[PDB]
Amino acid sequence: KKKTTLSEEDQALFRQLMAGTRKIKQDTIVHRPQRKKISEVPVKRLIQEQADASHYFSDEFQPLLNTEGPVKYVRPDVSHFEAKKLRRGDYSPELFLALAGLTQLQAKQELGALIAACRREHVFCACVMHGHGKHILKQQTPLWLAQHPHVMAFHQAPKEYGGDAALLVLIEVEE
């Protein structure tokens, strides 16, 4: 249905106000762009989000993590009680990421993808499984995670979600 608009007579009046003969009538073929899908989320946008998120994961920069006890981190400005809640298992992860067996480079990309996905889908808590390694994903991944601005807090996952081989991660989401 036609949208509400000024009357055709009113448009003619506007045409009348137009100084001079004041009418343009060039006729040309018209092309209209297809309407964007409501779902959207094109693979290219997803790839871009992933790349943006993984950009923060530097191998040269090592955040100071607590050396005593289970691995944990809380971003400055976030309530310290959040890490405690992660430890107690108050948070139930909605997304699970398995990194075991990936190269560092692959893992960074997947982590980025995970964070992007959490943001997109408004998922606040995710589980990251890195397995057990020395100077491997098990050690490097927490450092990378800390460097990410959207990561609020993480803690060694409870036994139900993989224990010492996994992390629960809290992700900052716009709601």
Binding site: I29, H31, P33, Q34
Partner: protein
């Protein structure tokens, strides 16, 4: 001088699809209306309309599916320099059947599917792909 008005018609349609032209006019003849009726029937043009009395003018309203154009590649096969007359067994299929080839058979101007079904070959005018 104009020596192949059919290839001129197909040129009008290639360059109209290539310029996002809404419709294409040309001088009209019996063979061009026969071909145009085959093209409308097979879904490559939207409509045709022959006007005029003493100088007829065929007008093809063209099709565009998405932003892309429907007539992907129209070629003239049996040009005046060298005419191509195929039998019912030699009668080709274009894009492995996804694209008709307008053959002038004795029964009339048909497609390749329609004339291979009718059991008679003829003069193959154009590939529409």
């Amino acid at each position: 001088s104009m020596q192949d008005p059919i290839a001129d018609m197909l040129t009008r349609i290639r360059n109209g699809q290539a310029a996002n032209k809404a419709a294409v006019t040309m001088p009209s003849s019996k063979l061009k209306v026969a071909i145009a009726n085959v093209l409308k029937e097979e879904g490559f043009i939207e409509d045709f309309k022959v006007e005029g009395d003493t100088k007829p003018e065929l007008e093809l309203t063209l099709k565009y599916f998405q932003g892309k154009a429907v007539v992907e590649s129209i070629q003239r096969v049996s040009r005046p320099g060298l005419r191509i007359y195929k039998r019912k067994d030699e009668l080709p299929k274009v894009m492995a059947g996804l694209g008709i080839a307008v053959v002038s058979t004795s029964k009339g101007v048909m497609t390749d599917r329609a004339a291979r079904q009718a059991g008679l070959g003829g003069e193959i005018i154009c590939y529409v792909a």
